[PDB]
Design a binder for these strands. Sequence first.
RNA 1: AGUUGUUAGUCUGUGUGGACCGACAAGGACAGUUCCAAAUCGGAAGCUGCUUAACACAGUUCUAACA
Length: 854
Amino acid sequence: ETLGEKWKKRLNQLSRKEFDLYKKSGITEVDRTEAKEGLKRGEITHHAVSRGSAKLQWFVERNMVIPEGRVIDLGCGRGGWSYYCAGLKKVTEVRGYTKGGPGHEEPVPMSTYGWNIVKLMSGKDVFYLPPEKCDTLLCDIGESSPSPTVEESRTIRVLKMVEPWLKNNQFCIKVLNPYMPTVIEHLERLQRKHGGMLVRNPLSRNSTHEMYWISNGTGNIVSSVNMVSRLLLNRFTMTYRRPTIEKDVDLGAGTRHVNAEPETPNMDVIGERIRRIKEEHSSTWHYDDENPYKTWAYHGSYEVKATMINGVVKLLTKPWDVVPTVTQMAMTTPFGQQRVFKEKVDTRTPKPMPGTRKVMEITAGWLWRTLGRNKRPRLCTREEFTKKVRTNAEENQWDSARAAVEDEEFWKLVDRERELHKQGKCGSCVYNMMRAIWYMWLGARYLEFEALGFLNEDHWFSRENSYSGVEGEGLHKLGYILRDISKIPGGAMYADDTAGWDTRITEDDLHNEEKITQQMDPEHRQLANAIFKLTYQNKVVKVQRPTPKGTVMDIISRKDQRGSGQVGTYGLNTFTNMEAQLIRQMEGEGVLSKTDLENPHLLEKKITQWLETKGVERLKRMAISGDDCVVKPIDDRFANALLALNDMGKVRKDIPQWQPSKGWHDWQQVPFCSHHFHELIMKDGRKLVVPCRPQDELIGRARISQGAGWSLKETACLGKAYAQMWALMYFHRRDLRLASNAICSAVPVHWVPTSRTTWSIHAHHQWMTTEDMLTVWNRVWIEDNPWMEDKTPVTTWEDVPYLGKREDQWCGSLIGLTSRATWAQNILTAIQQVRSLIGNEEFLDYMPSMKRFR
RNA sequence: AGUUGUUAGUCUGUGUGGACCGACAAGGACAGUUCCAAAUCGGAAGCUGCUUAACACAGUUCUAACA
Ligand SMILES: *OP(=O)(O)OP(=O)(O)OC[C@H]1O[C@@H](n2cnc3c(=O)[nH]c(N)nc32)[C@H](O)[C@@H]1O
Ligand SMILES: [Mg+2]
Ligand SMILES: [Zn+2]
Ligand SMILES: [Zn+2]
């Protein structure tokens, strides 16, 4: 009696809930709720048809099977495997076959990336098929039954049918029941004939002993079968473990043209960088050929080594241990990194139409002329960069940066590279996507700062100067900016997000952002042109990648797709967004039609006049920051001006490509910088405007102390910083104010907060002091607030207003539940516990600041 | 394998429709006197001293078990 059948019988002797829980013990699962909803609604993009997509992705990622050439899918069913395989590099045609009909699944015609090369046929049983020549053969046929002999016979039938297909080609066949002696003998004969191994997918439910026979990979069948069987047996009596969760597979959209995907790099521009990278790592450099990069270039790879809850906060915010999102925030590996790269960065946006490029050029020229009506560009200096680094104004490894700045050979390296830039070549300007390496990277950043740092150090995109940007405001002013927008006559307030803004920057966008050089001086212009044309339009990137033989860093390159970690990313993103929404408003007002977009030479007098007359006005109906936009057009035709927006390649997120945009009317609901804004009324009758966000996110981000040092002296100070931020910006949430008072009461008063709380450009970090928080609140919201005419100070933490209970609950509070009530009443005990744990330092009771404990 | 459904009760929304209103407050929540609401009284309507409906349609209301 083999082990497998023993497992089968033991399983067959289970009960209802015992079965329901044992089938999900220690397996990984895919959150299909979003996909289920989307498919139910009727979307045609960005969605896996079933869970077959992730199941095959697990194989494809680890190079167990490498789909290539023509892919034949047998038993495609809904089409998960076929649609996933349509979006790989070497694949060129996918044919899926299935029985279909009553009691069977049918293909779901969709338009994910690569749909134009996929043909799915129904009403064809594969068993009576005249097998053809296939370069990849995927088979996912099988029907599980309690009877083991029936499954055995079914398995033999499947293997017999599938054998005449395998003619030295990549394959992945599903074997439902591999623990039977004749099944095993047949598998061994097949392996001897064709090679390949037998492996278990970890996404497969626990109820089944299914495995997959795959081409790339060798091993012993019986040993692996026994290994899986023993795993099932030990999971039988193993304590229930909740199933690990994995994010669903994204699949892009649009037709795929394989003949236009590969990129031809300007080797004479990046050759020096590539050569230096090769020389530094010459022991392991090797042109791997299994590279999955479709739209980027590939140049090589080298081996490399592959590379916590805050105690105090978690000890004081217990009731949220059960909220799902709070934990889910806490949960960068090369597998996840590669998935992110494959489904987000590795696309190719179609070229704009002939008229659209002309429109974009005209708009960019006018916009750069208008932005520079007062200020003039200037070179930054070494001392400015030094000061900015020293003040520590997206990581924590700043001390090494400061040491590099204060060193001297570093500046010699920078000078050498700068002379190279003046010549017209770039040697060591290459950036990652995760100490000589440190100095080269920091020097590249410094040169970019020197050339394009005036876009921040002179506030080129402040609200006063740019008419749209919100640089230099901070959170406590975006609300008033939105309110002042809403008073302007017009339609709704559309905040249409864009999917992966960085990765949708056409070449023309860079060519237009380059126009700022037309206003500098030649000594500056040489350096700026060097930056633009040698490290923005020809970028060389390193990226990790896992392979059966460890982790290798790939070196790739591309010409579009502004890298997210460059100086001047914010400024140029804001500029592109401003001109994009300007064009969208242009179309919305009828000046720009389809015919105008299509003709190669649209007359520019019309656009010139429209801009010169109304551009400044239409620029005041917006609030822009990076990819975040809010726009209030004159009439609601704006919601249907999607030709210009989609043609430029800026496709909106989570909405079909042509469904008109949905705009709000209550400005207190329009999202902006991941916040919305509430208008409070104090007892004095003078109104405040405050930020707000689903407080699960706030608590989560408070419980994810990230490299702040394990030192209790440091985690406590980080918690204090978070609490003071809560008291200063989110004082109007009952849970947040209560928890903030608790934390600030359970940390010694003399300790100084460190380890900055947020990375957003919209935080001036007023909470990072040691002062009477009431005074800082007064300074932030009363004295230094341009929108508060009556400067009468607030004297105690009781005149400070609160959100209405309805809105407070609606934004994710926990008032009205029993656990929160008990926590609120017992908060003194938890404070005492933290005080005892800390030591014997001074503690001020901030709880009496509420009328609860007074 | 992928897919994954019924049954009964309960919370929304709407309509039909006489189909509700006010005062009040036990108690709870909240910590900004800020909100819930039993029980009671008063009125309103219906069928004669008693009642505050019932049904319909839809849910990612919740519950509870069955394929
Ligand atoms: O993961 P999946 O293959 O979808 O599980 P299935 O529900 O399809 O069942 C497969 C396999 O599991 C056994 N089984 C199903 N339902 C069961 C039950 O209620 N109680 C027991 N003890 N076993 C059960 C069945 O053998 C079937 O072949
Ligand atoms: Mg099943
Ligand atoms: Zn360089
Ligand atoms: Zn809110």
